[PDB]
Design a protein around this ligand. Sequence first.
Ligand SMILES: O=C(Cc1ccc(Cl)cc1)Nc1cnccc1C(=O)O
Ligand SMILES: [Mn+2]
Length: 300
Amino acid sequence: EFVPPPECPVFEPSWEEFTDPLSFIGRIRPLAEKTGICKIRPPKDWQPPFACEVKSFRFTPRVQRLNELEAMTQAVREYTLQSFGEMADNFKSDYFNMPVHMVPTELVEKEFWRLVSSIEEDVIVEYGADISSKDFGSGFPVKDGRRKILPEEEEYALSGWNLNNMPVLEQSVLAHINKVPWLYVGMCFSSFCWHIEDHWSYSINYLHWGEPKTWYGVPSHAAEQLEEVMRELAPELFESQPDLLHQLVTIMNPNVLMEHGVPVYRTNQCAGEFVVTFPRAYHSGFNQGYNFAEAVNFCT
Ligand SMILES: O=C(Cc1ccc(Cl)cc1)Nc1cnccc1C(=O)O
Ligand SMILES: [Mn+2]
């Protein structure tokens, strides 16, 4: 069965270290760049409110067939946050015959990877992925006037760890001659396959609420090693595809990469925790259950 990769670094900055995100990320870089991904737990008393327009939040999530690649050899339906959560919890509790909170993270992980390569069982899930923060607002409070902000929430609207306040403009000559966070509503086994960011950007990811998001990361020094294993083992029909298209179907069990000598690290990102991905650090992951994440690419 699946062997969990080693854990990536977790940082628990003090209030002093927590003052500036770019400064803190710059300081942890000698360790974190060697693991590709890292997790950051804010101080216990840092608790932003959840600020999306819940009454009107509606979406049609994409359908994900876990074993679609293995198989080489359902209409979109609309939910609210509440109705998606009812569906997601019923799915997971039915699947494991247990209350959702009682399912060990290790068992979801082992079952996910078994299903990805199974030919006898076809499991299909749904992912509310790539929902713009413009549609119903960010999960963080923002001082744009669309939604009321209480006085005790203003510090979160102004915080450098609010994803809407991260720097996003890349330096370039074209910038002289001449982006908002995205949201992800997860359910058990919804997933994202191996990729890096456009422009080799950093990314930062915050889990507002719900069950954990499980991540795998590869440090940038091993990016070419990973791409070589993909070439060798990915289906030939997709082998000639440009990376921007191949990344839509680059699903690969971390143990396969590990057997080929690619360093892989894992983490369970829990509610209230951040994950940072370093430049050119391949990453992939899946959701343990019903949850809500926000992510943005930022530059240093
Ligand atoms: O990219 C996606 C969404 C997605 C896009 C296309 C397909 Cl085919 C599947 C999934 N998500 C992520 C990308 N990076 C970090 C984290 C995530 C996340 O889901 O938490
Ligand atoms: Mn990404």
